[model samples]
Target chain A: MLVEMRTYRITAGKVPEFLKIYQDEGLGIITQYARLRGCWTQDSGTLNSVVFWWAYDDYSHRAAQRERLAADPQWQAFTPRIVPYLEHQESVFLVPAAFCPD
Target chain B: MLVEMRTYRITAGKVPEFLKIYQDEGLGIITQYARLRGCWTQDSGTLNSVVFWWAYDDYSHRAAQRERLAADPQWQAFTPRIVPYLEHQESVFLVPAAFCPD
Candidate 1:
């Protein structure tokens, strides 16, 4: 499986709101499309950043799942609510090293 | 446990060499000090980046473990071999969200 690491730089002082919305509404919708490896917020470096790791079968699977998620009505509705709270978002795709545990 | 996400940008065309050194030597030493959450190479977004996730009990534990790792004779000897292959390194600490799975 390939993993996608998504890091978001949230607007200062908006973490609580962002987390609340994500936990209450967004999480369920997202998990339907991708396996949630981990969801985290900055504790030491690069303040106000939220990061998420997700697993998929491959690039084609990721592309197909993301397209489906975007077309999802609930996701479409939820995007606007969180968009204002984010300053920037970065995505990196990763291939696990041989030694990494399953 | 807290997670530390470390991203390393390797010199162009040196990923195979870097991964070989890490898997053959560094992984054993590092995993003894911290729980290996994941180790990956960039497949998309940024090029030639290696990212690692490790877990610790807390900040204090992480500090202590790193100190020990640095003083380790084997680790000390291994550092120099990989130093020239790296272009830059970035680290960010993350606190798992409430809904994240164990």
Candidate 2:
């Protein structure tokens, strides 16, 4: 599996709202396109950030799934709502080591 | 659980050696303290980087576990072997949102 780790630096004090919106309106739509490994907020190190991981079969599958998500009406609606809360975003793709357990 | 997301930027072209050393000598020692969520090398966005996540019960638990690992003879010996391969490192701690699944 290809794991995409996304670190989102959110606007100050907006994590609660962001999390709520994601749980209520965004999770279902996103899960259809990628498997949610975990979603979290910063407790230490970098502050006011949300970090999450998503799994896909491969890069091509991930690209196609992302295209589908972007084109979805619900995702379109949700994007604007979350944008105001985000400051910066970083994404990195990862390939598991052979020793990593299934 | 608190998840520690670590992104290490390795020296150019050192990923293979780093992975091999970690797999052979580091994983067993580290996993004894923290659960390995995933260990991966970058395939996109960031070049020459290794990203991994480790889970712990809480900050205090994580602190104690790290102390134990650092003091271990095996871990101390293994540290120097991998240090030469790393260029930069970033770590972030995460607290799962209420909606996150177990």
| lDDT by residue for model 2 (B11-57), tens | 89888889999899998888888899788888887788887888888
User: Chain B of model 2: TM-score?
Assistant: 0.95
- Residue A96 of model 1, lDDT score: 86
Docking class for model 2 is: medium
The docking quality of candidate 1, as DockQ, is 0.78
* DockQ for all models: 0.78, 0.71
Once fitted onto the true fold, the runs of candidate 2 whose alpha carbons sit more than 4 angstroms away are none
Instruction: Report the poorest 10 consecutive residues by lDDT, candidate 2 chain A.
Output: A93-102
Point to the candidate with the largest lDDT: 1
Worst 10 residues of 2 chain B by lDDT: B93-102
User: Model 2 fnat?
Assistant: 0.79
lDDT of 2 at B96: 91
